[PDB]
Amino acid sequence: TPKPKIVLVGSGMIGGVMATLIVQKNLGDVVMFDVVKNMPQGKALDTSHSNVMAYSNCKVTGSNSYDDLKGADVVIVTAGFTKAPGKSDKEWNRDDLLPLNNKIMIEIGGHIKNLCPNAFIIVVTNPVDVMVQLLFEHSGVPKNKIIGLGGVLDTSRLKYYISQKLNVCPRDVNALIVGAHGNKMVLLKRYITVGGIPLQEFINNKKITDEEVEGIFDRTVNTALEIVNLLASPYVAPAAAIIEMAESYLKDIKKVLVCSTLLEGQYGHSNIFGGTPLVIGGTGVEQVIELQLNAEEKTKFDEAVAETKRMKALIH
Amino acid sequence: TPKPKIVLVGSGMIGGVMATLIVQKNLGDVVMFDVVKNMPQGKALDTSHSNVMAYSNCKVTGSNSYDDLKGADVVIVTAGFTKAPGKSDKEWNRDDLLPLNNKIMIEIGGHIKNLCPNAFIIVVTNPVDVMVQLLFEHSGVPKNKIIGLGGVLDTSRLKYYISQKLNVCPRDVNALIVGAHGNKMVLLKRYITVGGIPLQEFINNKKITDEEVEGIFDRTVNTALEIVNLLASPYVAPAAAIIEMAESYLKDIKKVLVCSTLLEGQYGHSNIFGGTPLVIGGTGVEQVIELQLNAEEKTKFDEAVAETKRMKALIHHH
Amino acid sequence: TPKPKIVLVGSGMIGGVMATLIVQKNLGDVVMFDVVKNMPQGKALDTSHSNVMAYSNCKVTGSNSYDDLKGADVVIVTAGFTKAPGKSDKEWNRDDLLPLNNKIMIEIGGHIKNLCPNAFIIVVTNPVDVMVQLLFEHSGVPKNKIIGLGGVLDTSRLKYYISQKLNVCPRDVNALIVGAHGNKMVLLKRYITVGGIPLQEFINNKKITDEEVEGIFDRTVNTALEIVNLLASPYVAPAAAIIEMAESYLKDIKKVLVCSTLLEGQYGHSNIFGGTPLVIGGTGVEQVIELQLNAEEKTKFDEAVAETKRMKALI
Amino acid sequence: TPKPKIVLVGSGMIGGVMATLIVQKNLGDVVMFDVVKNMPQGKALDTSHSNVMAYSNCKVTGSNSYDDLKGADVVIVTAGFTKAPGKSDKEWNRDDLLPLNNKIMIEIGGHIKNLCPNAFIIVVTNPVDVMVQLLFEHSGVPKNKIIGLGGVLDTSRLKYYISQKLNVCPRDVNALIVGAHGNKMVLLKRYITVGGIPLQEFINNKKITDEEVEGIFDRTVNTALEIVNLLASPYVAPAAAIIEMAESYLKDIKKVLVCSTLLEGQYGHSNIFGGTPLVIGGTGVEQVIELQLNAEEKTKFDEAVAETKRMKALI
Ligand SMILES: NC(=O)C1=CN([C@@H]2O[C@H](COP(=O)(O)OP(=O)(O)OC[C@H]3O[C@@H](n4cnc5c(N)ncnc54)[C@H](O)[C@@H]3O)[C@@H](O)[C@H]2O)C=CC1
Ligand SMILES: NC(=O)C1=CN([C@@H]2O[C@H](COP(=O)(O)OP(=O)(O)OC[C@H]3O[C@@H](n4cnc5c(N)ncnc54)[C@H](O)[C@@H]3O)[C@@H](O)[C@H]2O)C=CC1
Ligand SMILES: NC(=O)C1=CN([C@@H]2O[C@H](COP(=O)(O)OP(=O)(O)OC[C@H]3O[C@@H](n4cnc5c(N)ncnc54)[C@H](O)[C@@H]3O)[C@@H](O)[C@H]2O)C=CC1
Ligand SMILES: NC(=O)C1=CN([C@@H]2O[C@H](COP(=O)(O)OP(=O)(O)OC[C@H]3O[C@@H](n4cnc5c(N)ncnc54)[C@H](O)[C@@H]3O)[C@@H](O)[C@H]2O)C=CC1
Secondary structure, X not given: OOOOEEEEEOOOHHHHHHHHHHHHOOXXXXXXXXXXXXXXXXXXXXXXXXXXXXXXXXXXXXXXXXXXXXXXXXXXXXXXXXXXXXXXXXXXXXXXXXXXXXXXXXXXXXXXXXXXXXOEEEEOOOOHHHHHHHHHHHHOOOHHHEEEOXXXXXXXHHHHHHHHHHOOOHHHEEOOEEXXXXXXXXXXXXXXXXXXXXXXXXXXXXXXXXXHHHHHHHHHHHHHHHHHHHOOOOOHHHHHHXXXXXXXXXXXOOEEEEEEEEEEOHHHOEEEEEEEEEEEEOOEEEEEOOOOOOHHHHHHHHHHHHHHHHHHOOOO | OOOOEEEXXXXXXXXXXXXXXXXXXXXXXXXXXXXXXXXXXXXXXXXXXXXXXXXXXXXXXXXXXXXXXXXXXXXXXXOOOOOOOOOOOOOOOOOOHHHHHHHXXXXXXXXXXXXXXXXXXXXXXXXXXXXXXXXXXXXXXXXXHEEXXXXXXXXXXXXXXXXXXXXXXXXXXXXXXXXXXXXXXXXXXXXXXXXXXXXXXXXXXXXXXXXHHHHHHHHHHOHHHHHHHHOOXXXXXXXXXXXXXXXXXXXXXXXXXXXEEEEEOXXXXXXXXXXXXXXXXXXXXXXXXXXXXXXXXXXXXXXXXHHHHHHHOOOOOO | OOOOEEEEEOOOHHXXXXXXHHHHOOOOEEEEEOOOOOHHHHHHHHHHHHHHHHOOOOOEEEEOOHHHHOOOOEEEEOOXXXXXXXXXXXXXXXXXXXXXXXHHHHHHHHHHHHHOOOOEEEEOOOOHHHHHHHHHHHHOOOHHHEEEOOHHHHHHHHHHHHHHHHOOOHHHEEOOEEEOOOOOOEEOHHHOEEOOEEHHHHHHOOOOOHHHHHHHHXXXXXXXXXXXXXXXXXXXXXXXXXXXXXXXXXXXXXXXXEEEEEEEOHHHOEEEEEEEEEEEEOOEEEEEOOOOOOHHHHHHHHHHHHHHHHHHOOO | OOOOEEEEEOOOHHHHHHHHHHHHOOOOEEEEEOOOOOHHHHHHHHHHHHHHHHOOOOOEEEEOOHHHHOOOOXXXXXOOOOOOOOOOHHHOOHHHHHHHHHHHHHHHXXXXXXXXXXXXXXXXXXXXXXXXXXXXXHHOOOHHHEEEOOHHHHHHHHHHHHHHHHOOOHHHEEOOEEEOXXXXXXXXXXXXXXXXXXXXXXXXXXXXXHHHHHHHHHHHHOHHHHHHHHOOOOOHHHHHHHHHHHHHHHOOOOEEEEEEEEEEOXXXXXXXXXXXXXXXXXXXXXXXXXXXXXXXXXXXHHHHHHHHHHHHHHO
């Protein structure tokens, strides 16, 4: 009243699930944007009919024009490159990626600056902790108005695996994974709770062993690789995580969610984005919570941020 | 208590969205079954993590074994061929696919009979009015325990396009589409209401014209084609429609939903499945409602069933 | 963002259920206003804890001050009285209370005009079709920003009773009740559908008779009496009906809902509020739909509006 | 599976809100049972209409016959005295209700044994930790199939108050209150977290002081009295807490919820019910979690169970 406008910049796998979930939850009008012609229009048409089943009323439209950024309340960026040429046959590089995805962020940021400078922006494009800062820089939006997906998704894996071993509801496990999305993500064993009860109590009661916990941490780290091996880059859980973040903003819920945000001295770091618990409210990032890490924990957090800094320095 | 078991026989595009929606609604444990190796397992793992975001607790597992049909409460069949070397990259059709999908329904039917004969079955595989009857015949399930997807999806399109012209909530439009899923679907102009009000009133008040209605009618018939030409065969709205049907069963809601069901004299037809409103409750199909069509509407219904019979008669064509 | 502000002017039985449902649906911050001291503060404290179980974040506060209307997005008025003192329940009716309630609507109107002139207003206080016009006049709010509760609740009963005879989901019955809320309500048999199918088809197939339909019409008209003769106040269904209306506004859903709205030549009547299908969207009443009634139906609508005029000219 | 049946034994303030919430969530058919004639039939009629607004299909019926217990999946017991007949508020003595509510548990227990021995039972009647055990004994139901309301409600207050000081979503605060429902509830400061983060981190950062936390504890213990002083006993949040417990069973969610349950050695205590975290799934109580309390926390638990034992000894 008047209906929020959500622009999906990128209408691939994650984009399609997000449009579906937005309709289920009656969250706002959706523009599915892509550079690929016709594809976002077909997805939007199919998704728009699902309003009837959902008892919702969200316009869902497809676009190949950046003009549709005008009026956006929320912009979600999943746009990016992948795959490789000639290369033979398993040596697809990392890494350079990174200039190609940077050029995408330059293009998107320029239009955000021109067309929707007051939007709340969520960046998903990998490596997320690098790309979110690039978009921040190219778009000119305030620091409280842009974040990156990482912790909500990474902790959903950890929560889920622990919950299946302990035979409890998945959401009754709480856990924090910080620093960066990716292989350097910091899993904080000390902050795992189950129904509000420290994980250690379940270990002492022999409900789960130290070994099993370590195998679950390794599985959490290997999950994207596990699913890519079987199928493709994951998309259902990533979309669910993003919509949880977007909804906290649109409904001023003030959920505490771990996301990539600009660090300004926290954990000893500045001029860089990193994963940390934060509060998402109707004005955007309302609080950035700095965890009271011990020495071993801070050193893993430093390694996570050093890798973000490394990749960022490959951009010229 | 103790949590329904839902098996998706076919874990493609439609299968993926259904698993996603089942988790969102906390509806039951899900087995994602497919003949394609690794694909269901990967989709099931990705989907299982979304339980955290949804505050749900549905196990989601992937399978390449029919044994996992054991104990199913609901079985949803989207399984179908399936193209080979040739002969590309579009050479597919569906006329020649009829004997091939027949063979799929035989295989699935024999397994349902041995492993989950008390399941409620929803068939999606095209042409659905043909395939649902084939599954009924080879599974042995009672007539009230098997239906095909059609009307809920077809009417969603008609309801949607009308609501956008009249500027009202999509679900506040009501419409009935009967006969068969496909190009011979019967769109009943007489039975369209908007907030309970006959469509003819909005026409009389020049809010929409007769030409605009016919244009919306053509767009509804050709919607699958329109989306295929932009993208691929539709899957988000089909999944939503199937889940609304499954939920009515699992929660005994008793929604009146247009679905393909065994006709036993209704509309003058027997020994065939066709689309008609019916009531889905906790026992399956509780009521089959026969619309009181005029002569001109009945002729159209006749044409829909004739086309289903034509295709059924090609399950052994060479 | 920023979170809507909903003020409940009246915090009795219906107010209490409305605040509960607002939290369940996470629809906005709630101010529970009443003239009774401490009571709305007590209900608000209780209700605020239910945010935890609902995974919501709605502030629920109690107020005895009209100043809390400031910056309201939605104002729901149930302030007045349920039953006449000295009067029993075997007679449960209405009258002599009009002038008092007009003095309430004058007083509430004054405050709305000053503190929340851009709010969407829902009037619930009986006789609703009279009371909503009074508040409209004294609040100065535009015609598309104020409606009365009537048809959504009246039609919920008709839909429910028909759904139970025919063994289908209650919401799969559609029905229109118009004219006025109360004993002169116009139940339109022609407009009833079940799963989009004319009721007449089920009458033809002997699933329900013309006389059972007549008995359901009577039961619908007399439902409030039936409840009061058993123990008081419909409040649960009235609250769910109002929240359905409020939500359609707050979420721009554009539902077609029968409510009390200013008539401007529709059905032949003007300068009066009447019950008719409307579209509620993000800007308030976006459309008023005039049913194409036949002479027998238009005469019943006339008798409904005439009873509203009989009470309007009498304060 | 497919329409569960929920029987509400007691259709007073909490029963009315519970029936409302079951319909909203489409959780099951509802029987509103009470010894008061006509009243639950009136409440059930009002409530049934709300199925339309909710898009639900739950039958809601009122009853004065215990026959309605046959086929129950869940039975919720709020039946009981709130004050002794012929006494004033100045003469209030909580122990006075023990023999009066004991008689009610005996009556209800005999009918459960005969009619729905496989139902999951949730006891609400105060003092709940005593009453739940009386119903256990008289009903003969297995220990995994009967629990008392306490910790879900008590922790909702603590969670809510902390969340308002810290400006976060109420449900993102986690806390455990154990031992008994009432003034000797054990508020475990050590176990409080906010977004999974120990409460102490927020103290260290001066977002909240130790004194503020103490005043929150006091407020939490005294909330029912606060609400009564304004106008209670509380009913919205109690109803929501009970529905969260019943839903975890009906949908096999396996939520961890603090409820009153038979102690068989946990915390050094036996032959008594006390509040502790536990898992509710489709078979009932699937796990009872014994917290690893330190010595000081342990003595607070002992003091709470001592008071349950004192009151049980009165019978
Ligand atoms: N941050 C996180 O926790 C996670 C991040 N991801 C990342 O999310 C991104 C997207 O994932 P999927 O949807 O699975 O990939 P996808 O390949 O299916 O979608 C990418 C879409 O972006 C489009 N695109 C390319 N350039 C564009 C431009 N300039 N403007 C608009 N659209 C453009 C492509 O046409 C494609 O449709 C990838 O970078 C992936 O690595 C994936 C999972 C988790
Ligand atoms: N009834 C209706 O209103 C509509 C019907 N459809 C039909 O639904 C079907 C599926 O649609 P999509 O999911 O988009 O197709 P899809 O090709 O993505 O999914 C079909 C899946 O079935 C699998 N399969 C083949 N044989 C199998 C077997 N014996 N057991 C288990 N899986 C097997 C394939 O491996 C494939 O993964 C098609 O026949 C399509 O024409 C689509 C839309 C609407
Ligand atoms: N339009 C409809 O379909 C229906 C209308 N109603 C009507 O709605 C009204 C409320 O019903 P209940 O909540 O059951 O009544 P209730 O008596 O329980 O609550 C009314 C509240 O309004 C308060 N109040 C009185 N004057 C006030 C003022 N100056 N400002 C603020 N608050 C004031 C009273 O203190 C009382 O708490 C009654 O007029 C009732 O007859 C009830 C059902 C349906
Ligand atoms: N366990 C907890 O955390 C809490 C417990 N309570 C308790 O819950 C109980 C109910 O609370 P309210 O609904 O507010 O009280 P209420 O007085 O409104 O409802 C109690 C109902 O039980 C009925 N009743 C009495 N004996 C009965 C019997 N033999 N069979 C059937 N019905 C019978 C009465 O007619 C009355 O309608 C009280 O004992 C109260 O102390 C209240 C809040 C929290």
